[PDB]
Amino acid sequence: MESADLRALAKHLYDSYIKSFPLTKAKARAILTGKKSPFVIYDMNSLMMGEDKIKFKHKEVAIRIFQGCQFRSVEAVQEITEYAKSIPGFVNLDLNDQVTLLKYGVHEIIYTMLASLMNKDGVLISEGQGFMTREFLKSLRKPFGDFMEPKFEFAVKFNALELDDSDLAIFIAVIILSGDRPGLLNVKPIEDIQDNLLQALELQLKLNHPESSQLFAKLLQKMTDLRQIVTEHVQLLQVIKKTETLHPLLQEIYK
Amino acid sequence: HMESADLRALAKHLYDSYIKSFPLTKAKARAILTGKTTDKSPFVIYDMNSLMMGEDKIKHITPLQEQSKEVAIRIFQGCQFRSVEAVQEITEYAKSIPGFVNLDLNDQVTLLKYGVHEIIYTMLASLMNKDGVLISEGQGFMTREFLKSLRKPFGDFMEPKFEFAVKFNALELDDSDLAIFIAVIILSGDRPGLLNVKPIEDIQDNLLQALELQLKLNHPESSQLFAKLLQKMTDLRQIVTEHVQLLQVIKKTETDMSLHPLLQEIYKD
Ligand SMILES: O=C(O)c1ccc(-c2nn(C(=O)c3c(Cl)cccc3C(F)(F)F)c3ccc(Cl)cc23)c(OCc2ccc(Cl)cc2)c1
Ligand SMILES: O=C(O)c1ccc(-c2nn(C(=O)c3c(Cl)cccc3C(F)(F)F)c3ccc(Cl)cc23)c(OCc2ccc(Cl)cc2)c1
C-alpha cells in the first residue's frame, strides 16, 4: 500500500459515507452551533407538540421516547449495512462472515455516529429538524433516564477528538472489519482489509490533523472503549425487558 | 422510473439479502430433490414406521413437546413450528428491502401481517415437487401421499399447498427471481388499514420495475412471464383466504392444537 492507494481508499469511503447517511456530522454541527431553528423538545408539553409537528414514526412518555430510539436504531442498521457494501473487499467475504461482522459491529457504530448528532446539551433528531435536550432525556423516570445519559457521556468525550466525516468514514469501516467477532469462518481476509483501513486511517489523521499528536492511538483507544459501552448497553436492555415489556411482529422487528 | 443499472443493483442487493435471510434456497432444495449424489440424500417419511425411524435418524421432524400426541397433530405442529420460523426469516428479509424500515411503524406491521402467508406459500413451493416436501432443512422428505392421508380435517389441510406448488413451480423461477417477487408481495399498498399508501406504492413500483427487468434477462425465452407471475400473486390472495378459513375451523375442533403467539396475532383480524 502506497500513499496513493491509501488516499484513494479514504476518498472512496468518504464519498460512500456521504451518500449512505441522512445527516453528516458537518451538517449536524452547523445546526447545533446555530450557523430554520430545529424544533426543541425540552419537556412533556413540547414533546406532544413536536410529534404533531414532525410526525415521528419513532403510551407513557418515557417508553414512547425509548421506542423512538429503537425505531431510529433499526434504520441506522440498514444504513450501516448498505455502507458496509462499499468497503472494498467486504462483499467478497464469505456471506456468513458479512452477516456476523454487521451483527456484532452495528451497536458500536451506532454509538459512534450518534455522537455526531449530540453536544453536551442535547441530540438532533428527524434529520436535524428536532433537538431533544439532555436534561429532558436524563430526567425520564425508572431506568430510562439512566439509560439515556451514558450515550451523552460517551459522545462528549468522543467529540473532544474533533473528528470530521472524512475521518469517521474510515473509522467506521475499521470497526466493521474486526477479525475477533465470535463465529467468523475466514478471519484472514477480514484482518487483511482492516490492515488496509488502519493504514488509510493513520495517514488520514496525520494529514487532516497534523497538530493532534497520537490522534490515531487515541482513536483506537476509543474503538476499544466502545466494546465495554456496548456490553453495558445490552445489559441495561435486558433489565428493561424483564421490568417494562408489544405486538409479536414488533418484537420480531426489534429482536 | 429508475435506470437499468439501478434496477440491476437492486436485484443483486435483494438476492444477496435473500441468501442471507433464508436457510434453504430453491437451488439447494432442487439439488436434494434431484439426487444423483450420495451426501445430500434425505430420509423419506411415507408412513408411520418411517416417521418413527426418521425422528431417530434426523432438527426434530416434529416438536418433542408433542411426542405424546396423535400423529396428525404432531405433523401439524411441525408445519406450524417451521411457519413461525419462516415469519421470523421473512421479517428479517423485509428489513433489508430499501425503504421498508423507513415506513410508518404501524404500516410495517400491517405489511408483514398480510404478507407473510403469501410469501410462505410461495417459498414452500421451492421445497416441494409433485411427490412431497423437504423438511428438517432438507434432511428429510415427507411424501404428499402421507400428508394427504392424515385423518379428520388435516389431510385436506395439507394438500392445497402441493396443488399451488406444482403450478407455481411450472414457472421455473430461480432464487434471484423469487427474491424480488417476495419483496413485491410485501410492499403491497392495498393491505387493509395502511396509513400511508403512497410511499409503499413508490417502493413497489421500483420493485416491480426490477422484477420486470430481472425476468426479461434471466428468462428471455419465457414470453410474458412477468404477467404470468403477477397472475400468480393474485391467486395467492384466495389460496391464503382458504387457508385461514380452514385453520380457524380446525382450531375450534382440535383442543390439542396450539398456535404460536406470533401466528396467533397474525390471524387475528
Ligand atoms: O440518527 C441516528 O443516527 C441515531 C442513532 C441512534 C439513536 C439512539 N439509539 N439509542 C439506543 O439506545 C441504541 C443505541 Cl445507542 C445503539 C443501538 C441500539 C439502541 C436502541 F435500540 F436501544 F435504541 C439511543 C439512546 C439515547 C439517545 Cl438520546 C439516542 C439513541 C438515535 O436516537 C435519536 C432519537 C431519540 C429520541 C427519539 Cl423520540 C427519536 C430519535 C439516533
Ligand atoms: O420450510 C419452510 O419454509 C416451510 C414453510 C411452511 C411449511 C408449512 N406450513 N404449513 C401450514 O399449514 C401453514 C402455512 Cl403454509 C402458513 C402459515 C401457517 C401454517 C400452519 F401453522 F398452519 F402450519 C404447511 C402445510 C402443509 C405443508 Cl406440506 C407444509 C406446511 C413448512 O412445512 C414443512 C414441514 C412439514 C411437515 C413436518 Cl412434520 C415438518 C415440517 C415448511
Domain boundaries, chain A: 2-255
CA angle B244, B249, B254 (to 5 degrees): 120
- The H-or-E segment that residue A198 falls in is helix A187-208
Give dist(CA A97, CA B128) in Å, integer. 30
* Grid cell 426489534 in the structure block, residue: A254
- The three cell numbers of residue B119 are 410469501
Q: Would you state the torsion angle of the CA atoms of residues B147, B153, B156, B162, taken in this order, to the nearest 10 degrees? A: -50
How far is residue A217's CA from residue A229's CA, in Å, rounded to a whole number? 19
- Nearest Cα neighbor of B153 from B57, B70, B65, B40 is B70
Report residue B62: phi and psi, to 5°: -120, 145
Query: In the β-sheet with B43-45, what is the strand arrangement from edge to edge?
Result: B43-45, B140-143, B132-135, B128-129
**DSSP E strand boundaries for A31-128:** 39-41, 118-119, 122-125
Domain A2-255 has CATH 1.10.565.10: yes
Cβ <8 Å between A252 and B91:
yes
Asked if residues A193 and A89 have their Cβ atoms less than 8 Å apart, the reply is: yes
Distance from the CA of A105 to the center of ligand 1, in angstroms? 16
Residue partners of A3: CB distance under 8 A and separation at least 6: A203
Please name which of B6, B8, B9, B30 lies closest in space to residue B175, comparing C-alpha atoms: B30
- Distance (Å) from the C-alpha of residue A69 to the closest C-alpha of chain B? 13
In one letter, which amino acid is B257? M
CB neighbours of residue A37 within 10 Å: 7
* Cα–Cα distance, B157 to B173 (Å, whole number): 26
The Cα–Cα gap between B40 and B126 comes to 17
Beta carbons of B105 and A81 less than 8 Å apart: no
Q: Which three cell numbers stand for residue A255?
A: 429482536
Look up residue B127 and give its three cell numbers: 421445497
Chain A, 96-115: which have a CB under 8 Å from a chain B CB? Answer: 98-99
The whole-angstrom distance between residue A201's C-alpha and the CA centroid of its chain comes to 18
User: For A131, phi and psi rounded to 5 degrees?
Assistant: -140, 115
Q: Tell which residue, A142, A109, A124, A143, has the closest CA to residue A237.
A: A143
Beta carbon of A132 within 6 Å of any ligand 1 atom: yes
The per-residue b/e assignment along A4-36, b for 16 or more CB within 10 angstroms, e otherwise, is eebeebbebbbebbeebbebbbeebbebbeeee
Contact B189, B202 (CB under 8 A): no
User: Residue A214 corresponds to which cell in the numbers above?
Assistant: 497520537
Q: Which CATH superfamily is domain B3-269 in?
A: Retinoid X Receptor (1.10.565.10)
**Residues with Cβ within 8 Å of residue A166, at least 6 apart in sequence:** A10, A14, A204, A208
CA distance B93 to B17: 6
Which strand ranges, in their side-by-side order, compose the sheet holding A122-125?
A39-41, A130-133, A122-125, A118-119
Q: How was this structure determined?
A: X-ray
Task: Locate A182 and state its grid cell.
Answer: 465470535
Residue B262 touches chain A, beta carbons under 8 Å: yes
Backbone angles phi, psi at B143, to 5 degrees: -80, 150
